[PDB]
Design a protein around this nucleic acid. Structure first.
Ligand SMILES: [Mg+2]
Ligand SMILES: [Mg+2]
Ligand SMILES: [Mg+2]
Ligand SMILES: [Mg+2]
Ligand SMILES: [Mg+2]
Ligand SMILES: [Mg+2]
Ligand SMILES: [Zn+2]
Lengths: 341, 79, 127, 179, 153
RNA sequence: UUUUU
RNA sequence: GUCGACGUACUUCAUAGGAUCA
RNA sequence: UGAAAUUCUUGGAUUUAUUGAAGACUAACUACUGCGAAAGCAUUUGCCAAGGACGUUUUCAUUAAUCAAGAACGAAAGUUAGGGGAUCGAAGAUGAUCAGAUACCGUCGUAGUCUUAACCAUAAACUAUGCCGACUAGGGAUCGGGUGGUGUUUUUUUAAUGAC
């Protein structure tokens, strides 16, 4: 519990409450979901994060296939349209879609889409309470009009993945073939449901297969039709009937954003500067430089892995090189040119 | 960009003596006035010999690696 | 009220000596070595052997009247290694703990300006 | 606990790291060991003294001096702090020329072989043998327990004599399992 | 002024720096073992691939590259090196066969034809500025249960 | 299975 | 003499690489 | 030594201090930097001759490039005849022959290692890369010389030199 709070930034390395830690305690949610709401301030993403947070806080309003065909998939097709790699955006699709349903037809909508009636109503109620606490404490009457929100932009969707990853920085899983191609040999015939993954910070066993984690049958990825993303966010792990761990996916995250978010957490370390053609440690001064480094993600008893190299600005502070800011490929190339002129 | 036929004066001045458009000496000759007799003697700038004033037999210059070092107290003009 | 001697520590690969002598170096006060304090010849270079040797000389020196010693630590030197080994380091620590005042510590290893050949041969030694 | 002093001369290439790490060096010396610490900028030597009224452990002074000395040889601070924490750590030092008279590129390759690519070989020895190794040009220092430093020394020496890193690496696994 | 001293130090560090790359660059220059150079090349291609340092080739760029390859046919076994190895049984060995096949695959590459990144700055500036303790700590309380650089310190 | 500000 | 060195004439071992499909 | 044993040792070993003798070698400074046709060359001082580069409005005027024949030098090892013989050390002897990361270790040590006068003429004698000449990009470091500055420092009278 302390470790999870520290990763979220709630507690410092000495186990005192941070300003963020105090700030999360004001909300009625778990520390993970608060952190999602904490970072939502950018680009009017707050309505989407509130809906996602309320949905996860209350439980899944979706009815599973086991508990129950064309109609079922038809409703699933409608709500997965926002993103093909996110369970979270499937939840957001339903909750925000309900907002445009007039009150009289709400019951027909919930039955038509195999949606648990009770949970969504509490999700509606809990959305108002969240929007109330934020408006009241940021400056308060909230109408049903306030919950009506339009579709996210493509820029927003990428950001939501980053905010979601903020609260679940400790539940990122990487495809096993990336780390140990010998042990996890993936073929084009292999079912998506059988592709192994390895959670971060997983306790190493003598046999690596003991740490493998597979996609849950319920995830939209099982119907994806192509190879799954390199990294995946998962909410919880369930022991399937075949003694196989199944993971409830949240949404996919790219390497460079993942390093960006973990930079503020204790889950990222930087290698030595890289060398070679293209990759050259540009030295502005004896104390500051521009270079490429390989971020290592994860905490040597666990499973950590290296991310794609990212151009960084380093400064020498008290004898140690500290990464100040990340740099785009164009930004580094222009920098390499500038010292040449 | 530069014109080889018409190089800049400073550019030629920077170049080695043999590497200019038409090679020529960077040395010169001096009129050195003996402190005593006030007569004028012609001295090579890069003189390799201890030039002596004929009337007074006084040392006017001393040889060195390149340009000769003129004796202290000797006035000089470029000829 | 404060009498000085000199504590010479010779830290070789296979043994450690702790020799306490007067300031000149002619007169020996107490010589104890790692071998005299251990049952197995393997452990003569062991730090534990040095500690026992250092304590024994420290006790003996206090009986004589010596209350402080200047440390002149040395290795085998010559064509062999020049830095004192852990046996010498252990002997120095034990002497400090003994309460005997440590005056001045210097390394006096015999270092050659240039020496004869080393016993190893062209291919080296100490597999 | 009589009034005593130790002087440890800092070589020039270790002065700047001593500056950046001074904030983390005087606290343990002045607090746990109750030692009076100081650096003489004129002589560039770290000076430690026993405070008769405050210092209580007779071995504090020598314990502190070895800790400063370990940092001076090139060992990181935390590894040097292990000398203060424990009492059974020693430093083994020997030169490449002691093992084998190597010169020119032969000496450069010998140093490269010991360190290994990206320092992997040195870390392999350090982890297996539970020791810390500082590879200062042709001067090698090893820090750890007496039985441990000897094991690391043999692995290092085999590399100097020409044994390939790969074979030495396998030998490290065997001794590591025995440990 | 004393600022001049600051200028000399900054130059001194830059000079000490340039030497270090020169010494390292000089030493790496001498090592020309195939295995060593092969390992370095492989690791470099990963880093450039992983970081996508290389720009994507436009369709026109690929066409131009394909045009030169057809014009020249530089990556077939009619070259001097390939013909020399093949005709003299040196390609039966595994290593020289790999280089020949490496050349050939590289040539093949060029021959191929209701309605229902921007990195997030999680710094303190992008923050929900919400507004809401010592006495509560008194309630908790009631519950119960560079120094020494140049001078002696 | 439960269940919560 | 199932002899050594050389000269001559022969024999033999090291060939698969990428893409798709099951 | 992985543990032992050949070995030395109460006639005093190992260790300590004051000396003395012999023969080699020139640590750290030391750097692919400098020098030499190559092999190679590292303590101080003196003598003997030799040499590249630079400066020159000095002199000769094609005297030049490459080179079978032919000649000089040619690491280490090695041979002939004297000298020397400290260390290390092929050969030879001898202790132990138990234990696989420490598995070839130890002790005595002939020839040699060093030198003088001659032989031998081989190296991964490597940049696995003929010699001469011309041309084809930018950058800043270093070694030797030369030019320029109204630059810092020293000369602590100036200065002129030297060092930057
Ligand atoms: Mg020189
Ligand atoms: Mg000349
Ligand atoms: Mg001859
Ligand atoms: Mg003889
Ligand atoms: Mg050679
Ligand atoms: Mg040429
Ligand atoms: Zn006159």
């Amino acid at each position: 519990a302390i470790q999870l709070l520290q990763y979220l930034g709630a507690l410092d390395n000495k186990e005192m409450i941070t300003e963020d830690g105090k700030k999360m305690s004001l909300f009625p949610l778990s520390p993970r979901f608060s952190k999602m709401l904490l970072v939502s301030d950018e680009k009017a993403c707050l309505p989407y994060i509130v809906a996602i947070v309320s949905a996860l806080s209350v439980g899944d309003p979706f009815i599973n296939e086991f508990e129950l065909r064309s109609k079922f998939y038809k409703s699933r097709s409608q709500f997965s349209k926002l993103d093909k790699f996110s369970d979270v955006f499937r939840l957001l699709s339903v909750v925000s879609a309900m907002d445009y349903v007039p009150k009289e037809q709400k019951e027909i909508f919930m039955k038509k889409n195999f949606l648990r009636g009770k949970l969504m109503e509490e999700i509606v109620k809990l959305r108002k309470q969240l929007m109330y606490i934020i408006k009241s404490n940021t400056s308060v009457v909230i109408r049903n009009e306030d919950l009506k929100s339009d579709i996210p932009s493509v820029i927003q969707i990428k950001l939501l993945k980053q905010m979601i990853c903020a609260g679940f920085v400790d539940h990122v899983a990487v495809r096993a073939d990336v780390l140990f191609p010998d042990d996890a040999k993936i073929t084009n015939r292999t079912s998506i449901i059988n592709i192994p993954y390895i959670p971060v910070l997983a306790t190493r066993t003598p046999n690596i297969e003991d740490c493998f984690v597979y996609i849950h049958p319920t995830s939209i990825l099982n119907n994806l039709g192509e190879m799954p993303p390199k990294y995946m966010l998962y909410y919880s792990l369930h022991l399937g009937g075949n003694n196989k761990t199944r993971m409830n996916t949240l949404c996919d995250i790219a390497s460079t954003p993942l390093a960006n978010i973990a930079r503020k957490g204790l889950l990222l370390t930087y290698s030595k500067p890289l060398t070679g053609q293209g990759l050259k440690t540009v030295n502005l001064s004896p104390t500051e430089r521009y270079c490429y480094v390989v971020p290592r993600f994860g905490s040597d008893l666990k499973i950590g892995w290296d991310l794609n190299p990212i151009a960084v600005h380093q400064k020498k502070q008290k004898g140690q090189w500290t990464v100040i800011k990340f740099i785009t490929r164009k930004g580094f190339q222009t920098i390499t040119g500038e010292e040449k002129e | 960009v530069q014109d080889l036929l018409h190089p800049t004066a400073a550019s030629e001045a920077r170049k080695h003596k043999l590497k200019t458009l038409v090679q020529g000496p960077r040395s010169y000759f001096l009129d050195v006035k003996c402190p005593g007799c006030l007569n004028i003697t012609t001295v090579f700038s890069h003189a390799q010999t201890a030039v002596t004033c004929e009337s007074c037999s006084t040392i006017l210059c001393t040889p060195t690696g390149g340009k000769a070092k003129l004796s202290e107290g000797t006035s000089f003009r470029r000829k | 009220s404060q009498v000085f001697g000199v504590a010479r520590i010779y830290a070789s690969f296979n043994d450690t000596f702790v020799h306490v002598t007067d300031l000149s170096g002619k007169e020996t006060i107490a010589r104890v070595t790692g071998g005299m304090k251990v049952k197995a010849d393997r452990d003569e270079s062991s730090p534990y052997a040095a500690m026992l040797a250092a304590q024994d000389v420290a006790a003996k020196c206090k009986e004589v009247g010596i209350t402080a010693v200047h440390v002149k630590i040395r290795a085998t030197g010559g064509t062999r290694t020049k830095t004192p080994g852990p046996g010498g380091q252990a002997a120095l620590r034990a002497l400090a703990r003994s309460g005997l005042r440590i005056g001045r510590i210097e390394d006096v290893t015999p270092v050659p300006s240039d020496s004869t050949r080393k016993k190893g041969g062209r291919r080296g030694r100490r597999l | 606990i009589k009034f005593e002093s130790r002087k440890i001369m800092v070589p020039p290439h270790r002065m700047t790291p001593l500056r950046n790490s001074w904030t983390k060096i005087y606290p343990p010396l002045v607090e746990h060991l109750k030692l009076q610490v100081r650096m003489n900028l004129k002589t560039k030597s770290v000076e430690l003294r026993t405070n008769p009224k405050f210092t209580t452990d007779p071995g504090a002074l020598q314990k502190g001096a070895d800790f400063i000395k370990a940092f001076t040889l090139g060992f990181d601070l935390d590894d040097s702090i292990a000398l203060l924490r424990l009492d059974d750590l020693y430093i083994e030092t020997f030169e490449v020329k002691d093992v084998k008279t190597l010169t020119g590129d032969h000496l450069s390759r010998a140093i490269g072989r010991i360190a290994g690519k990206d320092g992997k070989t040195k870390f392999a020895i350090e982890n297996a043998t539970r020791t810390r190794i500082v590879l200062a040009d042709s001067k090698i220092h090893i820090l750890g327990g007496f039985t441990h430093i000897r094991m690391a020394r043999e692995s290092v020496v085999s590399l100097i004599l020409g044994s390939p890193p790969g074979k030495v690496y396998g030998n490290l696994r065997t001794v590591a399992s025995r440990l | 002024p004393e600022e001049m001293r600051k200028r000399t130090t900054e130059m001194r560090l830059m000079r000490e720096l340039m030497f270090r790359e020169e010494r390292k660059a000089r030493r790496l220059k001498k090592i020309k073992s195939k295995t060593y150079r092969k390992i370095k090349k492989k690791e470099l291609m990963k880093n450039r691939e992983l970081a996508a340092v290389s720009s994507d080739e436009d369709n026109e760029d690929h066409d131009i590259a394909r045009a030169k390859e057809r014009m020249t046919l530089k990556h077939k076994t009619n070259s001097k090196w390939a013909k020399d190895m093949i005709k003299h049984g040196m390609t039966n060995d595994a290593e020289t066969r790999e280089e020949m096949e490496e050349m050939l695959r590289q040539g093949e590459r060029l021959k191929a034809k209701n309605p229902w990144d921007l990195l997030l700055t999680a710094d303190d500036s992008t923050r929900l500025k919400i507004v809401d303790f010592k006495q509560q700590d008194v309630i908790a309380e009631a519950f119960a249960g560079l120094p020494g650089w140049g001078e002696w310190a």
